[PDB]
């Protein structure tokens, strides 16, 4: 009944197309896949997809703490190169570049699915760690007329609506319009967040074998919020005076500004010719823009990073411990992305062996025009952490003695051909597939007049086996590969070769056909080779041949034991380490915790005086982690508790509607989410309380 591209009946999804690009039951997928449903999201009312993943195993949602500027993730100890997202929407990648990275609001999603480990065999170039694939809402079967009001701490105000219906009797034409407007203050003083998004959609079904769904998304964010750096001195450890910087501290200029604009049009098309062939096609064109005027910190004056800062030097050595150095960046980017994935799915048998053959052509073009300016060492006055003074900063005064321009035009293109077969004999299922990619990149420096290019040709494949016992328990194992081009240039003035990803995984999945439960467990060995590292000569350039190894255990469970009880919980153990690095051999990558775990549960009363009342609570534990690649310090572990109070408005004469109270970080725990270096730390989110009223007419 449930479709991999539609809504899931409960908190536990059983269908998914991220792992195979075919509507496949999760037990028959030889890889780890997590699915966060719109229903689960409604439980926590997240502002970003990143927050919605707070309970998902093998995924770290704290690389920026409370900031939701980007949905940047670390999956199984890995992230894309250059601090870029690695997100997909409806099976096509939202290829971003530099600061130009698109973001989709959770209110517009039907699902948020996480794919752990290599996936190039189906998607092309990608980080070894995995990818995020969001699935847009689509026109509903029955009518939908929802209006939602939100009000919470830090002056958060949100109003949204979701409408869907047919325009004719037979249901040949249906539409769906979703929108929201949100204004709120950032956790840190002086910063604000604003978002206005609308998502028009239409589905045309000339016949029962043909579906054409138009999908568009328009979003404007005059202000995306805070995105600065705080030093470890004042966050993880106290300042020389034994005090810490408040969680709402802001080291940026008072006139800092960060904005983003997103425009997307595209469609999803499928047609079944007969029981043997089905054609499927997804395409999207995106034009995203982003601008910022940002003064950010760069750590205290005693920090190695500020070795030769004429401003830090002119300070009493005793004073270097509470003065924070800062820099600025004026950015302005424009990006266009065009993507098309066309598939042919064939179902046929060879004896007792049933087949599902997938062959497709997948390609994308992307260009990003960057016109920025960067301030160097003494480009912005020091900030006295003992007596912080927030003032306007003149971004126009581009002093050539301490700042320079940065105008680049990056172009990327990738075309790939892939084939996959899911052959099943009795209770055995074998997933085999391969993909060949042509990935070309070109970077033109407008200032220098230079131009760097590189054409890559990589082949990747994946094989695995699933055994389906007639009881729901189905063990499995698989081997998958991936590749990730570099954009770095070396001594010889050439772009390096792409690093690679190789993973071995064994696990078990329990999915009973009688009960709505899903439980998964997995053990894996992921390794990234040809990673870039420091030069053994020390020529300010980077060398190849580096290697990082990640291995761990993940177990996730989600299920509605009954009509009044839902349960979600997960556990993650991840041991990442540099196995070959001229500088960090033996260390563990920063921002990567060894242990994580979460448990959530909600109960609903159908009788007694509490009827129509839903109560929930959960906790999320994040192990400790290293604050830099040199492992010179650690970020303490932390535990956060969430709560929920929903009240079905059926008792008062309004079925389908409800009012709720959401609480994140119930005990207002004050913690440092993570640091990527001594001068780059982030406070976690302080307690948040949201009042929600969603009405359906």
């Amino acid at each position: 009944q449930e479709s991999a591209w539609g809504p899931a009946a409960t908190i536990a999804a059983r269908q998914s197309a991220t792992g195979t690009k075919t509507d496949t039951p999760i037990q028959k997928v030889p890889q780890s896949i997590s699915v966060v449903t719109a229903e689960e999201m409604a439980l926590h009312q997240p502002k970003s997809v990143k927050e919605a993943l707070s309970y998902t195993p093998g995924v770290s949602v704290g690389t920026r703490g409370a900031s939701n500027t980007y949905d940047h993730l670390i999956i199984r100890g890995f992230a894309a190169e250059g601090q870029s997202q690695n997100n997909y929407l409806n099976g096509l990648k939202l290829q971003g570049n530099f600061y130009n990275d698109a973001v989709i609001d959770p209110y517009m999603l039907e699902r948020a699915e996480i794919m752990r480990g290599p996936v190039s065999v189906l998607y092309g170039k990608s980080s070894p760690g995995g990818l995020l694939n969001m699935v847009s809402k689509r026109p509903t079967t029955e009518p939908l007329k929802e209006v939602q009001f939100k009000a919470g701490t830090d002056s958060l105000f949100q109003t949204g609506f979701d409408f869907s219906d047919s325009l004719d009797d037979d249901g040949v034409y249906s539409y769906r319009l979703t929108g929201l407007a949100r204004s709120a203050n950032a956790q840190q003083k002086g910063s604000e967040e604003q978002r206005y998004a609308i998502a028009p959609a239409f589905t045309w079904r000339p016949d029962d074998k043909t579906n054409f769904t138009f999908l568009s998304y328009f979003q404007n964010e005059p202000e995306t919020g805070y995105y600065g750096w705080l030093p470890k001195e004042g966050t993880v450890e106290p300042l020389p005076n034994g005090k810490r910087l408040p969680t709402d501290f802001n080291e940026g200029a008072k006139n800092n500004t960060y904005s983003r604009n997103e425009k997307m049009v595209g469609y999803s098309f499928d047609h079944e010719f007969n029981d043997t062939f089905t054609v499927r096609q997804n395409l999207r064109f995106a034009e995203n823009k982003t601008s910022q005027n940002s003064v950010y910190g760069y750590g205290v004056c005693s920090d190695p990073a500020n070795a030769y800062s004429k401003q830090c030097a002119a300070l009493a050595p005793a004073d270097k411990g509470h003065y924070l150095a800062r820099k600025y960046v004026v950015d302005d980017e424009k990006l266009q992305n065009f993507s098309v994935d066309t598939q042919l799915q064939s179902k046929f048998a060879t004896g007792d062996i049933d087949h599902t053959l997938l062959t497709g052509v997948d390609f994308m073009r992307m260009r990003n025009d960057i016109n920025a300016w960067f301030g160097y060492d003494d480009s912005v006055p020091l900030l006295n952490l003992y007596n912080p003074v927030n003032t306007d900063f003149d971004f126009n005064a581009k002093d050539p003695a301490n700042s320079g321009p940065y105008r680049i035009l990056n172009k990327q293109k990738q075309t790939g051909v892939y084939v996959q077969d899911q052959a099943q004999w009795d209770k055995v299922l074998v997933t085999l597939g391969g993909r060949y990619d042509w990935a070309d990149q070109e970077s033109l420096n407008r200032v220098a007049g230079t131009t760097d290019k590189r054409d890559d040709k990589q082949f990747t494949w994946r094989g695995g086996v699933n055994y389906l016992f007639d009881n729901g328990v189905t063990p499995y194992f698989s081997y998958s590969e991936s590749f990730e081009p570099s954009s770095q240039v070396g001594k010889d003035g050439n772009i390096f070769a792409p690093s690679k990803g190789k993973q071995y995984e064994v696990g078990v999945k329990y999915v009973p056909e009688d009960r709505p439960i899903v439980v998964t467990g997995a053990v894996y060995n992921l390794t990234k080779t040809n990673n870039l590292m420091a030069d053994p000569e020390g020529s300010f350039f980077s060398v190849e041949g580096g290697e990082i190894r990640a291995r761990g255990v993940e177990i996730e469970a989600k299920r509605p034991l009954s009509a009044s009880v839902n349960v979600v919980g997960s556990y993650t153990y991840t041991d990442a380490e540099y196995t070959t690095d001229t500088t960090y051999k033996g260390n563990t990558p920063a921002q990567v915790p060894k242990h994580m775990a979460s448990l959530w549960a909600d109960y609903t009363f159908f009788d007694g005086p509490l009827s129509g009342l839903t109560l929930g609570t959960g906790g999320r534990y994040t192990g400790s982690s290293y604050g830099d690649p040199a492992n010179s310090f650690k970020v303490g572990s932390y535990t956060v508790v969430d709560a929920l109070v929903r009240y079905d408005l059926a008792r008062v004469g309004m079925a389908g509607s409800n009012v709720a109270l959401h609480v994140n970080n119930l005990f207002d725990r004050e913690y440092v989410a993570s640091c990527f270096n001594t001068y780059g730390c982030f406070w976690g989110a302080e307690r948040q309380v949201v009042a929600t009223a969603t009405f359906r007419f």
Binding site: Q83, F374, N677
Partner: peptide
């Protein structure tokens, strides 16, 4: 700072 190195 665009980021690996910064």
């Amino acid at each position: 700072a665009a980021a690996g190195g910064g």
